[PDB]
Amino acid sequence: DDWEIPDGQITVGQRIGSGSFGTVYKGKWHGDVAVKMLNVTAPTPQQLQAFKNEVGVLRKTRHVNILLFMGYSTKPQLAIVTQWCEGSSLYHHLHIIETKFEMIKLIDIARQTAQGMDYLHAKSIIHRDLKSNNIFLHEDLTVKIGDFGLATVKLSGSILWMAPEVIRMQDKNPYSFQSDVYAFGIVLYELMTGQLPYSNINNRDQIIFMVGRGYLSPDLSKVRSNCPKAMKRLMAECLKKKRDERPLFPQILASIELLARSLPK
Numbered sequence: 001d002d003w004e005i006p007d008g009q010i011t012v013g014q015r016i017g018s019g020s021f022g023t024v025y026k027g028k029w030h031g032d033v034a035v036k037m038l039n040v041t042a043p044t045p046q047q048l049q050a051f052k053n054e055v056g057v058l059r060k061t062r063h064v065n066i067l068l069f070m071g072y073s074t075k076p077q078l079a080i081v082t083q084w085c086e087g088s089s090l091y092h093h094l095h096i097i098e099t100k101f102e103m104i105k106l107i108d109i110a111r112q113t114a115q116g117m118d119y120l121h122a123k124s125i126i127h128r129d130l131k132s133n134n135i136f137l138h139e140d141l142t143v144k145i146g147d148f149g150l151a152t153v154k155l156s157g158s159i160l161w162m163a164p165e166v167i168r169m170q171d172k173n174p175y176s177f178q179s180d181v182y183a184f185g186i187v188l189y190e191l192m193t194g195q196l197p198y199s200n201i202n203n204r205d206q207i208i209f210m211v212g213r214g215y216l217s218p219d220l221s222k223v224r225s226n227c228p229k230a231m232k233r234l235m236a237e238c239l240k241k242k243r244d245e246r247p248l249f250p251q252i253l254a255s256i257e258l259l260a261r262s263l264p265k
């Protein structure tokens with residue numbers, strides 16, 4: 001098939017924020033959309049390989065909890081268009097406006113997110129950057145996973161969600177399904193404590209270092225009083241410092257659809 005969206009069809013609008021490659025604008029193309037572009041006119045053959053990669057990946061995804069890729073554009077500048085999500089990122093809800101979710105909606109946001117990663121994984125896609133910033137609550141329900149980049153709030157990197165092996169840079173390709181599972185674990189941790197990990201440490205390098213040596217890990221004793229003992233039990237199985245001791249998502253997903261089935265009281 002062809003998803004090439006011809007020249008002049010897209011109508012760029014308000015500037016939303018900086019995207020992986022160029023900048024993300026909220027535009028129009030048969031309804032509101034997001035357009036991520038390249039600001040410079042020069043296609044670095046090392047950048048185009050990336051655009052031609054991102055488009056290559058979104059194209060494989062088609063599911064309620066992954067952001068909807070709707071089409072790409074090569075004509076002036078290179079762009080990738082996704083549906084426009086009305087709402088905020090989970091990171092925004094949790095840590096900025098400090099929204100207070102009830103345990104049910106929480107478990108659910110958790111369950112959708114898991115539901116989502118599962119799909120990406122079944123399609124043999126590693127996300128490599130799952131985190132509350134990249135989890136979008138479209139219309140306040142319906143988790144939408146994507147890699148929004150620097151659009152959405154807040155050489156560097158996002159340290160908190162990296163599993164140790166990653167934070168080390170062991171064998172040049174540290175990333176795995178279990179990589180994601182950890183990132184998911186920290187997300188669980190966020191949902192269950194409304195906080196980010198290691199808030200009492202104000203030194204990035206030390207966080208990187210210790211989380212790497214396995215001297216530091218999330219303080220699980222901060223889980224909200226009413227959290228189900230199985231959510232907490234799962235949280236840890238996901239944040240295991242040993243790559244191979246972590247659960248993959250088909251199990252994670254089920255462990256959730258189980259604990260979510262028994263707690264309306």
Ligand SMILES: COc1[nH]nc2ncc(NC(=O)c3c(F)ccc(NC(=O)c4cccc(C(C)(C)C#N)c4)c3F)cc12
Pocket residue numbers: 016017019024034035036054057058061066067080081082083084085086120125126127145146147148149151152153
């Ligand atoms: C403030 O920013 C915003 N508010 N509302 C918005 N609505 C949409 C957008 N939209 C985006 O930020 C956006 C966009 F406009 C175009 C492409 C991608 N790319 C991806 O989502 C992506 C890239 C690589 C891999 C993957 C996944 C994880 C699926 C894989 N594999 C996804 C985007 F995230 C921004 C918005």
